[PDB]
Subunit: 332 residues, 2 copies
């Protein structure tokens, strides 16, 4: 099968099937599958994109500049999240199918699929933190006195190959820039992780890394301005300040109508809180919060006296809707 | 709305032709289905729609006895094991995407493989157990033996009427479906054996042998002799479990001697009076590939050349074992 797939990939690169004018880009996809069937005839899991991609490099460029066709017993994307959701949909369909005809192990498997969905949801929150350890001589220097302090080699620099110094410096600068660029409750946790990474970033800022060594080299002729690294430090300070800004959160609380009112007052205080740069993102968060609060109304919702209590709950819900109106007024 | 559109699409498909029939292959028919979707889109101008047409937001049973579902922005898939395998392949592709560029993400990838594993167990282990007339019968079973005896159950017979009828009907329905229903295969056969033992428990005085006797006691014809024939069939099923119970006694991994022992065990398995008529052959084929894999696991300089020669002698022995397979196949 591997060899056939390779032959098919070769044919796709060399000889894309000449295409009947069917419009119907889904139709074109199926046509692609037909071309693959032709590849099978010629021989007698691989993937594509939409003027089109063939695959089992430039993918980022393609994302920068749409329907993906995965086979093998088929697929159609129309990027994990989609895959996870599709898997979940398939599982849901299987669960619906079970009603007729199927045991406790199968229920265990169904529970496991929901667990997998839950795990996939956690995955959407994404943090990686990078600890930068450049050089063996740098490590020896770290074991020795601080680089602000003389290195205490009687000659502290070797002229022949700083090229490595530059290479280690440029890469670090690039990685830090990318980290800077990259920078719900999950979102807050992720922002916290970002803060911790910045703190790692602040540890990176420090000398032992021999960022001071780098500064001393910057005293050294090559790439001295180092403004983009230095401007990058300023930007990292700004990011830490934003994490300080992101870090503040009014509590949203698991389950008291008075308590709900207190929560609303706290939310109003949060709406009041000092400005930090909000893109629509703050509005989207505001919207998600309102939806969650309705969810809280649902949690609260979760006999004539009972009917009266329900009516009282409805009056509260009206007040909550009014408070949401407050949210809209603040949003203005 | 979306559901209404899906329903309309299904209605048109039920009365909508795939208009032109040229160069018909399954993928082509799926293309035509995509075109039909085009028609649905034109007509409109998460859900799932199997296609036949049905939705989710007897024909299938006939199909199970004797093709594609397009989710809803479509995820057009084309069978729990198959689904799980597809999911596993998707998970592997997602992990493969990773090279793009943490430990949490690896945890998530491990979790997907765990899900594939769980899904495989789900494919392996479906099994369905028991029925109980308990409100009046269970108390009677507690009070008196499965014999008329004291007969410590209401002397009046209402002829069930419906109760007896329902009891018999439920017993008949249960009988019909359960009976009809690699290592995984062995585990499944074991589950089948246990289900047959459940059937034997169903057979007993603890079971409504007494209910059956009562049905007999009055005009009893809701459980046919098929019921008695069903007991014969259950004996046959126990015999099959005896058959389905079968020990390969063959193990994946001195090594050469172990392989010789495995070949001897395979020869012992080849000794056979019962086996799946084509399933045993498929298992034989799967085993031969797994044995090559085991050879790879064993495997995957003059001493090295000697080891290669020893491997070649083994390969000859494996070819001989394959020849022995052919004789048994005759």
């Amino acid at each position: 099968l591997a060899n056939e797939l390779i032959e098919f990939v070769a044919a796709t690169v060399t000889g894309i099937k000449n295409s009947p004018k069917e419009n119907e880009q889904a139709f074109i996809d199926y046509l692609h599958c037909q071309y693959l069937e032709r590849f099978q005839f010629f021989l007698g899991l691989f993937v594509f994109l939409f003027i089109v991609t063939i695959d089992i490099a430039i993918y980022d460029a393609n994302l920068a500049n749409s329907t993906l066709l995965i086979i093998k017993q088929i697929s159609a994307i129309y990027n994990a999240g989609n895959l996870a959701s599709i898997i979940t949909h398939g599982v849901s369909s299987v669960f619906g199918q079970l009603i007729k005809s199927d045991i406790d192990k199968t229920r265990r498997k169904l529970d496991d699929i929901s667990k997998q969905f839950q795990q996939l949801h956690t995955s959407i929150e994404t943090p990686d933190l990078l600890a930068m350890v450049p050089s063996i001589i740098k490590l020896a220097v770290s074991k020795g006195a601080t680089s602000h302090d003389y290195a205490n080699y009687l000659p502290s620099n070797d002229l022949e190959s700083m090229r490595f110094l530059n290479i280690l410096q440029s890469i670090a600068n690039k990685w830090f820039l990318v980290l800077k660029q990259t920078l719900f409750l999950d979102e807050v946790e992720f922002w916290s992780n970002f803060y911790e990474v910045l703190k790692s970033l602040i540890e990176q800022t420090q000398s032992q890394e021999f960022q001071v060594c780098l500064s001393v080299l910057t005293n050294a002729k090559r790439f001295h301005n180092l403004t983009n690294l230095l401007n990058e430090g300023s930007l990292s300070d700004k990011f830490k300040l934003a994490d300080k800004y992101n870090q503040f959160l009014s509590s949203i609380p698991i389950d008291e109508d008075l308590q709900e009112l207190f929560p609303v007052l706290a939310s109003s205080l949060k709406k009041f809180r000092y400005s930090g740069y909000p893109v629509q993102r703050f509005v989207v968060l505001m919207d998600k919060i309102s939806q969650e609060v309705m969810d809280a109304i649902l949690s609260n919702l979760s006999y004539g006296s009972f009917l009266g209590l329900y009516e009282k709950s409805a009056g509260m819900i009206e007040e909550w809707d009014d408070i949401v109106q407050d949210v809209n007024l603040l949003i203005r």
